[model samples]
Target: PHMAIHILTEKEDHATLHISFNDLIKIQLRTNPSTGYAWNIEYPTDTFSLSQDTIKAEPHPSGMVGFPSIREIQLKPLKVGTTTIKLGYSRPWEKGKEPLRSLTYSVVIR
Candidate 1:
């Protein structure tokens, strides 16, 4: 279906979001690979259609560089139901090096 996509983000972690079925949900976050940290998402594979993308951060009016990039995790609900998603912020290339925080979002599709 053609429609607006709901945005799920860090501040709304653990919050419940209601979206229409067939709509899109975008999990976005600020990321700077320079720090070596990355996002790892955990969700049931059959729950939704997943896609990945990244965009350059908005340039400062002064033309500053090296700003954090915006990563977009797009998921389209498969049906009318409820599901939870976990977004882990950690280092993928580095094992045993864990970040203490993560985000969880419970989505209710109607």
Candidate 2:
């Protein structure tokens, strides 16, 4: 199962998120044959902003497939509010079943 990542970082703060997955091969991962995988950020409002999206690593920085391992995302100047950060992966699938992970957290600017 996939889980969301949450962290507190300042604007222009460069941070690397280190993720861990149980097993890659046993999970039977699937990836694009062309551009591979792209991770997108989603807000709770259902609106999407792709300026902070990233690509999946071949061996995966965390050494696991289909799982977000040690990855980096640039954070923009955040507005003072409860921002919900979600992760959306690029894949084609029906509405019934899907593999996606995200987390919602509150933020305050000093």
Candidate 3:
């Protein structure tokens, strides 16, 4: 069984989060795959580990089309440590091009 810790989103960019061992953390960001750009997350070290769970499209009440999907990354604290996760929104094929936008989340596992 997994317990949900505090969810981190783009709204909490540059935020520091704390979690307990066995707690699960989810990072969700809006993404538009049609644009060839996606949210890529990188961590400073293996202080923690996370994986992409799913990318779900957002529901539109107005029935609009071409809306962005949600890119979700899930993590489970395996040990007690601190590390920073950086997420960049960019295209995979483009080299030497800076990301359109970037965000960082600092996490502490207890």
TM-scores, one per candidate: 0.80, 0.35, 0.84
* Candidate 2 error regions (>4 Å): 1-38, 44-52, 56-71, 96-100
The lDDT, on a scale of 0 to 1, for candidate 2 is 0.36
CA displacement after TM-score superposition, residue 91 of candidate 2 (Å) = 2.7
lDDT of 3 by residue, 53-77 (tens): 7888686634334357878888876
Name model 3 segments beyond 4 Å from true.
Answer: 61-66
* lDDT of every predicted structure (CA atoms): 0.78, 0.36, 0.79
Candidate 3 CA-lDDT value: 0.79
Best by TM-score: 3
Overall local distance difference test of candidate 1: 0.78
Residues 1-110 of candidate 1: C-alpha lDDT, one tens digit per residue: 55778888788989998888768899888776667777788887778887655655645533345347677789987777889998887777657565657898998888
For candidate 3, give the lDDT of residue 25. 79
Q: Quote the RMSD, in angstroms, for model 3.
A: 2.6
Clashing pairs in 2: none
Sort the candidates on TM-score, descending order. 3, 1, 2
Q: Model 2, 59-107: lDDT tens per residue?
A: 6345455444324453432233334455445544436344353223333
Q: How many residue pairs clash in each candidate at the backbone level?
A: 0, 0, 0
TM-score of 2: 0.35
